[PDB]
């Protein structure tokens, strides 16, 4: 687990053979990480859109460990001010908001 | 309630005597709402910062009802692509992330 929100909900993830930190972000549809090298096929995706779009590489069905939960989901790889775990992967780990 | 994350976590809020919709956004530090007229004193606050800053009006100790829970917290009023309930109010309602 239960994560309270007095601080930013930053968690450790394992991806592409590296340990990274990322923000659990219920306001984000998608997961965006920078400075990871993922194997295999990808397609460009345009994201953002305010002021222009940002082009990223979309990798599908990526194995990722988020806080000890091994799951599978789409990871967008591209520059981002903070690594972000979006709703796409929060559903995979069974993460809910509760009050 | 328990809110799953397959869709965007949009909830009804009551503020400044109006019903509004807003996104429960764990990636946001602050709460930003547009098109609301709040009484009393405020101070400008600079937010954002990438590409420039956006100036908003910061109102403190605002009574707000979020999804049934009557709480008090800072509300920033200004243009926002979508109304956002940030961590500052999620702590007030006792909202946690759980998996």
């Amino acid at each position: 687990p239960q994560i309270t929100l007095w601080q930013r909900p930053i968690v450790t993830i394992k991806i592409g053979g590296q340990l990274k930190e990322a923000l659990l972000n219920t306001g984000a549809d998608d997961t965006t990480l920078e400075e990871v090298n993922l194997p295999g096929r990808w397609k460009p995706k345009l994201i953002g859109g305010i002021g222009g779009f940002v082009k990223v590489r979309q990798y599908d069905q990526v194995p990722i460990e988020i806080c000890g939960h091994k799951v599978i989901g789409t990871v967008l790889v591209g520059p981002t001010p903070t690594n972000v775990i979006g709703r796409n992967l929060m559903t995979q780990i069974g993460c809910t908001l509760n009050f | 309630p328990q809110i799953t994350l397959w869709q965007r976590p949009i909830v009804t809020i009551k503020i400044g005597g109006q019903l509004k919709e807003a996104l429960l956004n764990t990636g946001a530090d602050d709460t930003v709402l547009e098109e609301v007229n709040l009484p009393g004193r405020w101070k400008p606050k600079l937010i954002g910062g990438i590409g420039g800053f956006v100036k908003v009006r910061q109102y403190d100790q605002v009574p707000i009802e979020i999804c049934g829970h009557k709480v008090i917290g800072t509300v920033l009023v200004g243009p926002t692509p979508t109304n956002v309930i940030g961590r500052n109010l999620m702590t007030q309602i006792g909202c946690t992330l759980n998996f």
Partner: peptide
């Protein structure tokens, strides 16, 4: 901070 989304 404050982060949302959009393709």
């Amino acid at each position: 901070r404050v982060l949302f989304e959009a393709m």
